[PDB]
Every structure is written in structure tokens, then in C-alpha cells.
């Protein structure tokens, strides 16, 4: 007999056993990204090559404009979006909703006038032009703030995001641009120093418009690799504001799957399918198109997004309309950086060398491989001398998720073309759409599907005819969630979440148990599965921190001490799993931290030692993560010896200033301080008061008081 | 006339007692502090 | 260097035999799991 | 997980718990058998385990 | 250190981590029961994950925390410490005598006060005590019996009384807000439980609007909670003859529209055109709730059949003695006499299908249903995007 | 800003400020700072009286 | 009431603040610093009551004129 796992589907529906199909247990694919970036640029320009090709006179880089371009005559992807059709869809959406555009725009403006510059510190890695690399958002923002100070640019000290965006827009006009660059001076040692460097206006414009690239290695279910783009800090404010506006608009739209996540999305899915089933005529058919859009960002022109921003803010202050239209302008004239370049080697001499991108065309193309040969022969027209590709048309993945979703919902909501005897409506979310078409027969259902496909092709949207299919309503999939006959199996993909959280013992344990309980609540993880997950997690947790049961004969550094503690203390049911104690957690008490769980079972000496008011292993500065576990997940833990932190792997200026302010005003670490005065004088007054109180209480000597007073005296606030 | 920085100008100093001026100033200071916490203070622009 | 594409192979026979053999009982057991707390609710009894 | 779901589905049908019935069977329900393999073009069943 | 070393103080944990030990107490003293392996119907609801000592908005929570554990930096106490004075003094006394770092206590107090709410699939009780154990209680194809180890009715009554008192007078808003902020429930003004729960009865929503608070923007018509899905209805005045023979000039909605409709425990989807109800989908929740939903949606839809089904008279008032608009007069008439428009509405064949099944005029799950009404044996989850949009008060 | 006005001011003072703005044909929504100033003026006047 | 007013010298704590009789002037720190001058209260206040009474007087005046 020859076994066959697929035969399981003979006796079980695929959706029921869908979890086993996905290989979400092996090693996810991982990676030069220059080839992929060049290919992406090539495809983006190829789809829009028939547009209007001109040369930007502000930067000198070639630009291709597909908007209002020739209507496609083939199924191939098309970025030729007609502006009038986009405005028609927007107008239909506006008519179908009561002043939604006005409310969303006003709320976006109000929350923008309240936003601070420091909000730009959130997010992921960002392109830094002072070094032309990818740096953490906080560091990039700090460096750009520092550089702006030299060229007479200010507004960061002014607080709100409005002055920062205003002086960012101003910076594009300064005849020069001075900043600090890293200089790895040789002395042999390579020591980094700060060198005051300057660049011209064109170079600065190119740097600001440049989009850095990286390989999307983390992907799990795709063989071919995609490139993710990181933008600079000079686009983050505008992109953030437009994204917030689009989120405000799309949240009300019942057709939008974002930004709601979790059981809310399932609720929306089931409610929508039930609605469409209810709305079907008598004996008619409601067909569901399971769609998976491709080239969702290589066909969306930023000019269409500029038009959408202008139409959305039809009635708003001129200043806000201008401000929110900057992001589409910056994206419509963007430039793409190109990885690290190809590598050429000779095997007859065992020699290899990576060729930096600026030197791509310094070599005869007859030496690159034929594929890269064609890639470069096609990329030559748009190649910048500095080593960047002029990429005007299209968008990089991840920038305008909300705005693209709003455009998709606009396409969905037309609901009819030519008053044909059918209707359509659906769910759209960031490159994944599920459509429903109701008619009186299958033929009319596909007439409607074809009409919707054509309408999508009029906005740059090109549904994938290879990754999509159609069937009867009541069975489909949306964003990897499967619906069949009312049964929505949360596809079990949260399996790679049972490892230790890697923050500390107690916190890792709390996070793991909360993860188990949340999975039980949401994904339908059965009680036996939850018990086995507890078992496996406890095994991994004991192994990773070298703390097994004290009785067990395992050897280790901390294990000897655990063994000692095992008999040095009588009460053996109160020890923690980090102290070789017996596991006590079960399904009924996953919501209780174990320290409180075992509080009764502990011994007075043990609880006194572990729960000491002061612990050298516990520090105030270590409390930052006690609320949210990095997605920010809330976990409940208990102060104790096991609440420690791991070793670390104008910087010092800001860091130590903030640290000292926190140490002076202990309330600052919890809630935002309030005051319209310099930090120095606040600290001086507080320290003077504290010194006087310490002396009056006898905690400080008289010589100590005099010294303190002198210092505080010198400072100038006594 | 009362200002947000805990100072005032009165044509006659006997028109209002200590409690009234203290209470109005406390309300103004609370409003200022709440605005600063919400960052509306800088955005706020006076009667001119 | 020209890209090295994977070879285009055929159906082997060892994969099927290993699939069969790894899916059979053996007198030897290695997989062991840590204990958990006592089960007091009926639901956790069913789970156990 | 999947097997859990399977068992739960069975439990949905008739009220009592079947984890002993699906695995080994009982006096009222036969042991659960899937289709596992084949031989000479003849598909073969297989126990729950 | 866990083995030897300095021995600390055990007192602080008795009260500092009060919420955790209360969780353990509720678990230990809970009583378990049987397990029902049959399928469980679950509805997606906005539920509070954990019980709260006194629910308050985040800003008030932060101010209270600072007033508790940060004696310094307490300039100009706002109109929030007097409301929570009892909580302030209780927590202050309890936490005194400790040595834990202040940030830990601040975060624990934030957990104990600031509310945490989420969308969850629930079936049965919904109090935070049951939500804590929802992972064990519920189940897609299994359910367990669990019993864990008031002010609402009083606030409903107080808000209704305030509404009735203020309406009869002129300029009701100022009088209503005066009474609302001058009222108290045994330790605190009415802005201590109104601000706690999300939404509530229509009277509470109106009072919250009169006061300063956020109210869910669902449209309340009688008892119906309506959420528009699509379409725009033009409210145009029209002269329509009522079934009683009289002619009334009232506003009618031209154009098609659809609303998610809720009433008590009944949820559904309603699709209506001008002067006609088109479709209604419901789930079987409760006979009383289903009848209320059907009748109220009937009156709201302004179906010509509903007008032609009137048989008595419409001259009613309220407890304050005022003449209402014809819509609410019809609402009261039909609710008082439910078997008025039901008889002459007309019947429709049962929804022949796998699950769709009909319901008769008596609310029993009997076939030969009402024209348009349909009961699906599925779960309808509605009322998304609770934006709490800006709402004015006249 | 309007959210702050709603939170920190009673509905009565907001209504009076809105009426005053309407008398001057000034939109409260387009000038939230002016509405806040008028509300503060009314509140301080009432507090004085 | 008032600004720093250094006439009192250094600041005083809450415990020493209570020692002052009603109506005195004290130099205190508000929030994170912000020196100010304060006066001990002789009563307990209710802003809502004041606003309600003001509205009542205003509408009484409106009705009387009407």
C-alpha cells in the first residue's frame, strides 16, 4: 500500500482541512536586490510606455505620464487611467454618502493641526539622504532636523507638523544644502567623524525624491521575490496626512475591508455575503468572484491620486488643499535607488567584485548575463548618471494603502453600467478584492463581471485573470480567510507565534499564555490543541532559559542553583517555571499571571525574596515595555526578580537630557509634562526645592546644601 | 482683563474679591494647561 | 555568472517509501511533553 | 488542530463526546476510517490514528 | 536571590495587585456545569475584555492616576477629582505603605480604570466577568456552563425623568443639563455611570448629548437602532390619506435605502423604497423582540399598506401632554394594537431554501410568512464603524 | 478643536457662543478658535457674576 | 493668583501650605515647575452651579424684558 495525504480530502472538505495545505512550518524564503529593483522599474515603465514621455525641468529626469493616455486594446496591464472616469466614480461615491468627503477632510485637518512632528518617529526604517542609506525613523528624523538647523530652517522646535512640512517645502528652494555626513577617516583604524558637507539644489531635490529599495524576504507564500521601497522623511508627513484622510473616508464605506482587523473583518465578510444573498431576485444567481489583484501598484499613477485628493477636499481651506496635495506631487516625480549593484567574477583567477550601481554602464554590456544585459539595455533611457532610475509612473508597495483601497471601493460602488439587468458590490482591501454580481442567470452575471473588469481597467486597476476565479455565492476566500456555507475557518496561520517573546521570563510567559488564549477565542483552537500548545511552549520556555524542574537530573549553571532551591525551600508548588517549579497553567487560568496564581502556594521566605520592593534586577528605565509587547500587544505581568532586561547590542545630548528630566520629575515618564518655560529652569526650581526639603528633613548635610546651592546659583535660577 | 499667564489688569481693585480673581485665574490656567497637553495652545490664536 | 536554475527531475521512489515508513508505529517513543496543572473544569477534562 | 476540528464536528452531530468512538469506536458507533492509500488501483481506508 | 538574600515585605501585594487577585477569586469560587456539544450561535459584539472598578475616559483616568500617586504636580484640579473623590481616597490609602516603583503602580491603575473593548464572538452573558473566561466558556461546537464567583436601571429612570421634566418647559436643554449635572447617585453626579457605559437607552444618549460625552451615532426611531448602508433618501412633504379616512401632510423619503436594524436582541437588514418596504432579513432571537422589530420597521418604512391598515384613531400624547408627529402617533397606535397591520399586510410563500425559513404573524417559527419578512438560520453581524461622528444638540 | 470645546465647556455656553457667532454671520466651524474665545468669555463673565 | 512674587523666598510644600491661614499668599510650583502665587481658599466651589445660576438669571432677565 502506498500512502497519500491528499486522500484526506476525499473524506473531508478542503476548507475544513485547509490549514494543512499551507506549508507554514518550514523555513520562509530568504535572499542582490538590484536585479529585482531594475526589473520592477522596467515593468512599471513598460506598462505605461505609450503615455506622454517628457523631461522634468526641475530635476532633469525622464517622466512618463499615462493618465488620460490611450485606452488599452489588450488584456495586458494598463496604467492609462482616464481622469473623467475617476471623477465620475468619486462623484457617485459622494452622492451615495451624506457629505462623507467633507466630514473626513475636516476631521483630517483637525487631527493634523493637533499632530506633532514626533509622530514621524513611528513606522519602520526610512531612507536617510544625509547618508543615503536606510536608518531607523527616529534617527533619520533627528538627523534631518539637525541638518535643517544649519540652512536656516526651523519649525521642528515649533512643535506641530504644519511648520515642519512648511520648512520642508521651503528647503527645496535653498540654493545650497549643508549637513553632517559620516566620514570613516583612516588613522590602521577606521574612525567615524562628522564632516560638514554641502550639496546643490538639484542634488538635494533628487535625494528628497529618491526611494530606497530592499528585498521583501520575509514573504512566506510567494516563490518570486518582490522589492519593498522605503521613502525619506520629507514625504512621511504628507503621506501620513493623506493616508489618515483616506482611512477616515474608507472607514465609513461598508465596502472597505480596512482598517478593521480581526473578528471585525469576518463579521463584515459574513454580513456582506448575507446581504447579497438577501438582495438576489427570484430565481436569479448571485455569483462571487474570488479576485487576487496583481500589479496593483505598478499601474496606479500618482496623478490619479492627486486628482482624488483635490476632489475629496472640494470644500476645504485652500491651505489644507495645497498641503494635502503635496504627497501626490512628490510621488509623481519620485526616483528609485538601485540596490547594491551586480557582481562580476572570473573563475580562471578566482576573482570576484561587486559593481556599484553608478558604474552599471561603465562596463560593456556584453559582460553581464544575457538577462541582465536585456534589463540594462531597456533601463538605459531612464538611468540617472548618479545611479538611480527615474520612476515617475506607478507606485511602490505599501505607501497609499488607504487611498488605493478608496479607489477600489469607488470602482466597486458604481454598481451598474448602462442600466443592464444586474448589480454588483463587494469587499476591497489593499490588493485583495472579492466581488458579488447579482443577475437573472449566469450569462448576465458574467456580462456584469466583464463590465466591472473593463471599468477597473479605466482606473489603472487590472484584476489578475490567472489568480482569480468565479463561482456561486456562499464559497470564496478573502485575504486568506475562507468562507463556505456560513463556515469561516480562520486559516490557522498564527502557529509561528508560540516561541518565547524574548523580552524576559515573566513577560515572555504572560505573552505566550495570552497568545494561546487569544488563539482559542479567535481561531477556534480546540481545548486539546491549547493544552498541547501550553505543553510545547513550556518546554521551549524551560529550554531557552536553562531552567528545568529542580528534581530532574539535567545539568547546567543555573540548574545547580535551581536544584539547591528545590530542597532549601519546603513549599514546592509555589516555585515559578523559571525556578524549576511545576507547571500549573491550564485552560481555565490562562488569563491570570502565575505570580498571583502561585501566591498562596509560595513560602513566606520565597515570596519575600522574589517580591522584594527593591531588586537590582529591576530598574525604572526597564519599565518602558511593561505595557505593550512589540504590533503593540497588551500583557499583564508582575514586578519581581524575573522582570529584568537584556544587555544592549546630538544622540547623547537628547538621550541624557530626557533621562535626567525623567529622574528629576518622576511623573514625566508616565504622562506628557505641561509648561511654557525652558526645561532648565523647571529642573533648577525642582532641584532647589528638593535640596531644601532634603536638608529640612535631615537627609542632606549643611556642607552638602551649600555646594548644591552654589551650583544651582551658577545655573541662574536661584 | 485677565491673561493666561496669571496676571491681570483691573480698573478698580475693589470690584472683585480675592476669591473671584483666584477662581477666574485658576480656570484660565487649567484651560491653558489642557490646551498645552492637547497641543492646541500654540495653534490657538488670540482675539487679534 | 549565469544564474544556476534547478534541475528538472522525475518522480523518485525513496520519497514514497519514506512517507510510508515514517508514518508507522514503533516500539520506541521519544516525544515527551511537560506536565500542566490539574484539570478541574469539565472542558479541560475533555481536553485532557 | 485539524483532527480536533474533525472530532468536534462529530460531537456536533450527536451530543456526547466521541474521541473514544472516532479512535477506537464504541458499541453504538463504528471506528472512524478515512481514505489513506491505495494499491493496484484500489484505494484503502485507514484508522483515525 | 530567589533562594537566599534579603526578605522583603508581603503587605503590598494584598492590595496593590487587587485586580489580579480579584480575577483569581472569581476563578476559584466559580461553579462549573455540563458541556453542550451542540452547535452554538455566536454574534460579534463590542465587549469589555476585563471588569473595571470605575470606567472613565482615558484623560480622566490619567488625571486620577496622577492625583493618586503623584502628590506633586497637581495644579488646579479639574472637574474630575470631585467626581472620583472616593476612588482617589480609597486607592491612596490602599497604596500607601508600599515601595514599588511608581510607574508600575501607574500602569496597573490604568489597567484597573481605563476600559479595554474589542469585537468578539459571544453567545449568552456579556459582562466582563464572563468575557474573562470566554476562551473556555464558548466554543464553535461546544458550550460550558459557568457562574463566576443595579446602577443601570437607576440611570435609565433618572434620565427618563429628567427628559420628561425638561421637555414640558421652554428651552428644555438648559434645564435638563442643570438637573443632570446637579443630580447624584449615592456618591457621584450622573457623569459617573453615563460616561462609563457605551451608549445606552435613547434618554441616556440625549442626556449625554446635552452634557459633554460621546454617543454612538446610530439613528434611534422608537426602539429601532438604524445604521444606513447606502442610498440617499429625499425627505419631501406629501399629503397621504390614512386608513382611518383622514388625510395627513407628512414627510416621506423618496428613493431607495437600506439600514442595519437592531432592537433588543434582534438584528436584521432592511431594504426599503419610497412608500414601500422591500426586504427584511432577521435572525430568531426572541418573540417579543422580533415582533417589536417587525412592527417598528413597518412603521418606519412608511409602507402604504401600513397606512391603509389603520383602524382606530391617532390623537395620543405623552406623559407631559403634548401632541406628537403622525409618525410617532402611528408607532404608538401599532405597538398598542399589534394585530392591526399584521392581518391586512398580506402573506407571502415561505422562503423555500436550505436555511431561509418564514415566520407568521404570531411570531412563531411557522411557514407562510409575512410579505417580505424572512428569517435566516445564520448570524447577522452589523453596526460597524461606530465613528461617534460629531452631533449637535438643539 | 471642537472636541476640546465640547469636552471642557457645557452645552449651554456652546449654544450661547454659537448664537452670538450666528448674529455676526461668522461660522463657528470655520473659526473654532474664535468659538473657544467666545465660550471662555461667556464662562468668565458668568463666573464673575 | 499672581506670578512668582519672590517676596516669600523659596517654595513651600503641601504640608507647610496647610499651615497658612485662609486668605494668605504662598509661592508654589505648578505642574513641572512653573512658579506661581496661590491663595488658600475659604470655601468649596462648583463651576456647574455657577453656570446654571447665571443661565437662570439670564433667562429670567430675558423673560422679564419680553
Short mmCIF file of C-alpha atoms in Angstrom, two decimals, chain B residues 2-48:
data_model
loop_
_atom_site.label_atom_id
_atom_site.label_comp_id
_atom_site.label_asym_id
_atom_site.label_seq_id
_atom_site.Cartn_x
_atom_site.Cartn_y
_atom_site.Cartn_z
CA UNK B 2 -7.22 88.58 32.64
CA UNK B 3 -4.31 86.82 30.95
CA UNK B 4 -3.38 83.15 30.68
CA UNK B 5 -0.06 83.77 32.48
CA UNK B 6 -1.66 84.51 35.89
CA UNK B 7 -1.67 88.31 35.64
CA UNK B 8 -4.50 90.81 35.32
CA UNK B 9 -5.38 94.49 34.97
CA UNK B 10 -8.35 95.89 36.90
CA UNK B 11 -9.69 99.43 36.61
CA UNK B 12 -10.78 99.19 40.26
CA UNK B 13 -9.17 96.73 42.67
CA UNK B 14 -12.22 96.52 44.96
CA UNK B 15 -14.68 95.38 42.27
CA UNK B 16 -13.71 91.72 42.75
CA UNK B 17 -12.63 89.96 45.93
CA UNK B 18 -9.59 87.69 46.21
CA UNK B 19 -11.69 84.56 45.67
CA UNK B 20 -13.21 85.72 42.39
CA UNK B 21 -9.90 86.68 40.81
CA UNK B 22 -8.28 83.50 42.10
CA UNK B 23 -11.06 81.35 40.66
CA UNK B 24 -11.05 83.03 37.25
CA UNK B 25 -7.26 82.74 37.10
CA UNK B 26 -7.45 79.08 38.11
CA UNK B 27 -9.95 78.38 35.34
CA UNK B 28 -7.77 80.21 32.82
CA UNK B 29 -4.66 78.32 33.94
CA UNK B 30 -6.50 74.99 33.74
CA UNK B 31 -7.67 75.84 30.22
CA UNK B 32 -4.11 76.77 29.25
CA UNK B 33 -2.68 73.56 30.70
CA UNK B 34 -5.30 71.40 28.98
CA UNK B 35 -4.66 73.18 25.67
CA UNK B 36 -0.91 72.65 26.05
CA UNK B 37 -1.47 68.96 26.80
CA UNK B 38 -3.58 68.74 23.64
CA UNK B 39 -1.01 70.91 21.79
CA UNK B 40 -3.77 73.39 20.89
CA UNK B 41 -2.01 76.17 22.81
CA UNK B 42 0.46 77.08 20.07
CA UNK B 43 -2.20 76.57 17.39
CA UNK B 44 -4.59 78.73 19.39
CA UNK B 45 -4.55 82.35 18.21
CA UNK B 46 -5.98 85.15 20.33
CA UNK B 47 -8.67 87.78 19.78
CA UNK B 48 -6.36 89.77 17.47
#
